[PDB]
Amino acid sequence: YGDSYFIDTDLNQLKEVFSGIKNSNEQTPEEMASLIADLEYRYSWDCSPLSMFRRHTVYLDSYAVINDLSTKNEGTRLAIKALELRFHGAKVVSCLAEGVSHVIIGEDHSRVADFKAFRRTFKRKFKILKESWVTDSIDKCELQEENQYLI
Amino acid sequence: MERKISRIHLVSEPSITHFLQVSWEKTLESGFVITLTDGHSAWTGTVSESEISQEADDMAMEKGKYVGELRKALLSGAGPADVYTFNFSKESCYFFFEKNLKDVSFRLGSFNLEKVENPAEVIRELICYCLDTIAENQAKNEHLQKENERLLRDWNDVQGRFEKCVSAKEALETDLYKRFILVLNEKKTKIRSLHNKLLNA
Amino acid sequence: MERKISRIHLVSEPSITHFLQVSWEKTLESGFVITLTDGHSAWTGTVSESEISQEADDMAMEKGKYVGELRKALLSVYTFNFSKESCYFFFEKNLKDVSFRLGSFNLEKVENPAEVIRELICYCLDTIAENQAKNEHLQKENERLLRDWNDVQGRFEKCVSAKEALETDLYKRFILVLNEKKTKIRSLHNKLLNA
């Protein structure tokens, strides 16, 4: 490509080099995201303050029932939650598979009974934080340091 | 089943107030009952086969323009610019819905009225339906005010999110390009160093 | 100036209907007037100042059992026993092992049948007009705010999608150039080592 060992490419030259390289779709989104995460972790690029939810595929249980198309939650804030999740790179999923490692319910947290029942059943001990943490991305708009995770 | 409260005031006797309450029932094709009240006496309406037949065969309306006239004359649908002399003869107990259209009095409105079967069934219904209508008005007012507050707060939140995402994109393009330049320059330096070593290997 | 609306359930006899209509005005700090009207026979009586202070002092209990009970009676079970031969309205609060008399408002009867019906007609008409106007203003207000919300949702969604697409294709191009440089590094290492 246009990159040279004697003449370095500045912002504009690198932009032109990238544009000259044709852009298409040849890699699956899952594989491309996985390689992005691996490269970012290999040289500490995932620490960007705007994109940290690439690995954390948070499942939002916006559906009370399963496989029912006769209802539509109009005027609800679930779209706001989806936008907040996709701002940092997290993509929500509506179909359950084996790749989902987190289950998050909406403001209806009075369902602690099923969480208690599933703690004894599931060996995958889930982690549920307070709803203030997600609002901290708007109010504080700052990441949470690792010093909070202590004894 | 419903009472239509329409603002109306008599002209002949301003002290005595009567309501031109055309409380049409559901399935108006089946029929309707007129409701005129004064405080102590009421009146209703009946529908008969002969009455339906004469209504169909006398006025002779097939794809006409009487719906608007019904809405304006009976429900006072006209704007508060033209006064309608819908005076109910209290002394005669005769309601003639004559049309004072530019001071021309044809023989238009003259139909019989039926004796009320029970004034209670209309008086109680009116005094309960007015309260029910006020209560539901207050309820929908409160609910829509709450919805207005929710809309305002979510609009402000998503405007803030729009500003934040614009800033994030503007910083992301620049810092991504800078990181790419740094990585590629480091890789080029690695290539140059390895080539220099191989040149005198 | 306004009128309170409340619903009471009568287990014994539901075939007889009575409605309370008391217009509240002339606050108690300078005398008050209680007006009663069933919709057909109005009894407008003037209460006295000798039944306001002694009500909370005759039995000598907490004043809450009067002020709070009056406040929660308007904001919503009494048994209705109205004597037509005495023209006096009273009600007794009956519970299990608890019985405290509450209503002791003296009332009289008027003869005018036109003043009260005019007041009720004006009240209902004005309430209907004001609630319709306020409600209509509020539907229009919330509907164009919800249109603005829909527009801002759409523009935020498209802006976020554009940002994500730019991030994705920049990542794709950087990945391509990084793979190119990785292959170059591998080839140069092979040249340095094998040759």
UniProtKB/Swiss-Prot annotation, chain A:
Location in the cell: Nucleus
Cysteine disulfide partners in this protein: none
Residue ranges occupied by any BRCT domain in the UniProt entry: 48-151
Listed result of changing residue 14 to P: Found in a patient with microcephalic primordial dwarfism; uncertain significance
Expression (tissue specificity): Testis, thymus, prostate and heart.
Function, in words: DNA ligase involved in DNA non-homologous end joining (NHEJ); required for double-strand break (DSB) repair and V(D)J recombination. Catalyzes the NHEJ ligation step of the broken DNA during DSB repair by resealing the DNA breaks after the gap filling is completed. Joins single-strand breaks in a double-stranded polydeoxynucleotide in an ATP-dependent reaction. LIG4 is mechanistically flexible: it can ligate nicks as well as compatible DNA overhangs alone, while in the presence of XRCC4, it can ligate ends with 2-nucleotides (nt) microhomology and 1-nt gaps.
Illness the protein is tied to: LIG4 syndrome: Characterized by immunodeficiency and developmental and growth delay. Patients display unusual facial features, microcephaly, growth and/or developmental delay, pancytopenia, and various skin abnormalities. Severe combined immunodeficiency autosomal recessive T-cell-negative/B-cell-negative/NK-cell-positive with sensitivity to ionizing radiation: A form of severe combined immunodeficiency, a genetically and clinically heterogeneous group of rare congenital disorders characterized by impairment of both humoral and cell-mediated immunity, leukopenia, and low or absent antibody levels. Patients present in infancy with recurrent, persistent infections by opportunistic organisms.
Family designation: Belongs to the ATP-dependent DNA ligase family.
Protein name: DNA ligase 4
Species: Homo sapiens
Gene this chain is encoded by: LIG4
Included range, full protein: 761 to 911 of 911
From Swiss-Prot, chain B:
Name of the protein described by the UniProt record: DNA repair protein XRCC4
Result, substituting residue 193 to D: In XRCC4-Asp mutant; phospho-mimetic mutant; abolished ability to bridge DNA
Record flagged with keyword Membrane: no
Organism: Homo sapiens (Human)
Main location: nucleus
Record note on modification: Phosphorylations by PRKDC at the C-terminus of XRCC4 and NHEJ1/XLF are highly redundant and regulate ability of the XRCC4-NHEJ1/XLF subcomplex to bridge DNA. Phosphorylation by PRKDC does not prevent interaction with NHEJ1/XLF but disrupts ability to bridge DNA and promotes detachment from DNA. Monoubiquitinated.
Substitution effect: residue 170 to A: Abolished DNA-binding
S-S pairs: none
Phenotype upon changing residue 55 to R: Abolished interaction with NHEJ1/XLF
Gene name for this UniProt entry: XRCC4
UniProt keyword terms in alphabetical order: Chromosome, Coiled coil, Cytoplasm, Disease variant, DNA damage, DNA recombination, DNA repair, DNA-binding, Dwarfism, Isopeptide bond, Nucleus, Phosphoprotein, Ubl conjugation
Coiled coil: 131-165, 184-201
Cellular compartments annotated: Nucleus; Chromosome
UniProt-reported outcome of changing residue 65 to E: Strongly decreased interaction with NHEJ1/XLF. Abolished interaction with NHEJ1/XLF. Abolished ability to bridge DNA. Abolished interaction with NHEJ1/XLF
Chain intervals for the UniProt region annotation (Interaction with IFFO1): 1-201
Free-text tissue specificity from the UniProt record: Widely expressed.
Residue positions where Phosphoserine is found in the record: 53, 193
Impact reported for residue 161 to Q: In SSMED; no expression of the protein is observed; complete loss of function in DNA double-strand break repair
Biological process according to GO: base-excision repair; cellular response to lithium ion; double-strand break repair; double-strand break repair via nonhomologous end joining; immunoglobulin V(D)J recombination; positive regulation of ligase activity; protein localization to site of double-strand break; response to X-ray
Region Interaction with LIG4, annotated ranges: 180-201
Molecular function in Gene Ontology: DNA binding; enzyme binding; FHA domain binding; identical protein binding
Stretch of the intact protein here: 1 to 201 of 336
Family indicated by similarity: Belongs to the XRCC4-XLF family. XRCC4 subfamily.
Result for mutant: residue 26 to E: Abolished interaction with NHEJ1/XLF
Gene Ontology annotations for the cellular component aspect, listed alphabetically: cytosol; DNA ligase IV complex; DNA-dependent protein kinase-DNA ligase 4 complex; nonhomologous end joining complex; nucleoplasm; nucleus; site of double-strand break
UniProtKB/Swiss-Prot annotation, chain C:
Taxonomic superkingdom: Eukaryota
Recorded disease: Short stature, microcephaly, and endocrine dysfunction: A disease characterized by short stature and microcephaly apparent at birth, progressive postnatal growth failure, and endocrine dysfunction. In affected adults endocrine features include hypergonadotropic hypogonadism, multinodular goiter, and diabetes mellitus. Variable features observed in some patients are progressive ataxia, and lymphopenia or borderline leukopenia.
Tissues where this protein is expressed: Widely expressed.
Effect of residue 69 to R: Does not affect interaction with NHEJ1/XLF
GO cellular component: cytosol; DNA ligase IV complex; DNA-dependent protein kinase-DNA ligase 4 complex; nonhomologous end joining complex; nucleoplasm; nucleus; site of double-strand break
Effect on the protein of changing residue 71 to E: Abolished interaction with NHEJ1/XLF
GO molecular function annotations of the record: DNA binding; enzyme binding; FHA domain binding; identical protein binding
Family affiliation: Belongs to the XRCC4-XLF family. XRCC4 subfamily.
Localization of this protein: Nucleus; Chromosome
Organism: Homo sapiens
Record region (Interaction with IFFO1): 1-195
Biological process terms in GO annotation: base-excision repair; cellular response to lithium ion; double-strand break repair; double-strand break repair via nonhomologous end joining; immunoglobulin V(D)J recombination; positive regulation of ligase activity; protein localization to site of double-strand break; response to X-ray
UniProt-recorded name of the protein: DNA repair protein XRCC4
Coiled-coil parts of chain: 125-159, 178-195
Primary subcellular site in the record, as a coarse category: nucleus
